[PDB]
Design an enzyme around this catalytic site. Sequence first.
Site, PDB file in Angstrom:
ATOM      1  N   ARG A 221     -24.323   1.142  10.887  1.00 20.35           N
ATOM      2  CA  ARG A 221     -23.014   1.426  11.497  1.00 20.35           C
ATOM      3  C   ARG A 221     -22.569   0.319  12.458  1.00 20.35           C
ATOM      4  O   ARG A 221     -21.375  -0.037  12.510  1.00 20.35           O
ATOM      5  CB  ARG A 221     -23.051   2.765  12.246  1.00 20.35           C
ATOM      6  CG  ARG A 221     -23.368   3.939  11.337  1.00 20.35           C
ATOM      7  CD  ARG A 221     -23.594   5.218  12.124  1.00 20.35           C
ATOM      8  NE  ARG A 221     -24.348   6.170  11.329  1.00 20.35           N
ATOM      9  CZ  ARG A 221     -24.738   7.371  11.755  1.00 20.35           C
ATOM     10  NH1 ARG A 221     -24.473   7.747  12.997  1.00 20.35           N
ATOM     11  NH2 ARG A 221     -25.411   8.186  10.936  1.00 20.35           N
ATOM     12  N   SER A 222     -23.494  -0.187  13.271  1.00 20.86           N
ATOM     13  CA  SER A 222     -23.148  -1.246  14.213  1.00 20.86           C
ATOM     14  C   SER A 222     -22.632  -2.484  13.478  1.00 20.86           C
ATOM     15  O   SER A 222     -21.681  -3.133  13.938  1.00 20.86           O
ATOM     16  CB  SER A 222     -24.372  -1.621  15.063  1.00 20.86           C
ATOM     17  OG  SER A 222     -24.786  -0.574  15.944  1.00 20.86           O
ATOM     18  N   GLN A 262     -26.552  -1.643   5.884  1.00 20.42           N
ATOM     19  CA  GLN A 262     -27.850  -1.155   5.388  1.00 20.42           C
ATOM     20  C   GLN A 262     -27.832  -0.628   3.956  1.00 20.42           C
ATOM     21  O   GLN A 262     -28.908  -0.433   3.374  1.00 20.42           O
ATOM     22  CB  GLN A 262     -28.369  -0.010   6.273  1.00 20.42           C
ATOM     23  CG  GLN A 262     -28.991  -0.434   7.567  1.00 20.42           C
ATOM     24  CD  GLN A 262     -29.415   0.772   8.420  1.00 20.42           C
ATOM     25  OE1 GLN A 262     -28.583   1.569   8.887  1.00 20.42           O
ATOM     26  NE2 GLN A 262     -30.710   0.915   8.610  1.00 20.42           N
TER      27      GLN A 262
END
Length: 284
Positions: A221-222, A262
């Site tokens: 998410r980052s 990811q």
Amino acid sequence: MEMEKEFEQIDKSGSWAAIYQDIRHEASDFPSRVAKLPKNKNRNRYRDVSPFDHSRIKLHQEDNDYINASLIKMEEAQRSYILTQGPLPNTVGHFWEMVWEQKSRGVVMLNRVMEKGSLKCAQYWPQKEEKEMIFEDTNLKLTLISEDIKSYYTVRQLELENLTTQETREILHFHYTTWPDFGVPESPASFLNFLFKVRESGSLSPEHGPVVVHCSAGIGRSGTFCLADTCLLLMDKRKDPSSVDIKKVLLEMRKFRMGLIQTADQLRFSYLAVIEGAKFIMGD
Ligand SMILES: Cn1nc(-c2cccs2)cc1N
């Protein structure tokens, strides 16, 4: 190729996994020797997510200067970000030490403290005005000033005091609360609205230190957050916005921290966010 039509071409051909694996194959590999020292085992949440030595943030301490955090410096866009893991019970003091030393204005949090029935990060900020937090190992005090709860995110005003010098600073906490336990959001509209609120606050601007952004590992998410921001800024700066290549930008960012984005679903979501976001900027 352009972005929106490269997008439909990958959807129709169902090749997102192959595109994403190409990125993984081409990504930089740099040493992370400090992260793997035995004295730092309880400073790392996941054994396979480490900051590179060349880009890691150093704490201003002579005993142990290590934190699992990286400086992503984007030269053409003229933006910097610090990406870090969700703080652990034994690193909450280091986390706020970093915010102080790097002169950050904002903290961006993209996870909930509990997800999938397990703890994803420590409760590292105070939940009631009258119950402040003191971090004795780093000599800082943190107080909740105000809280604004909306349907997709919450914004908090916090006061950080350096107890050694009695200096104080105002920190803004931007908490995206609705990312689903599994997968990615169906529409990027609420994530983009959130990004614009961070921008409007001044937290991403050059008159402050870099924004601190985290999720549980600080790569998924980052990575989506900073990739979307940088791509949209480049589209505003350049004569030809269709020249912005999201895969190239992601590979540039992975020179500074491993593993950003990811899953192939996160990659597709990043494309979707930049595509929709470019229409709202204009000129609309
Ligand atoms: C009244 N007041 N307001 C603040 C903050 C403002 C913005 C972030 S923190 C701190 C104090 N003492």
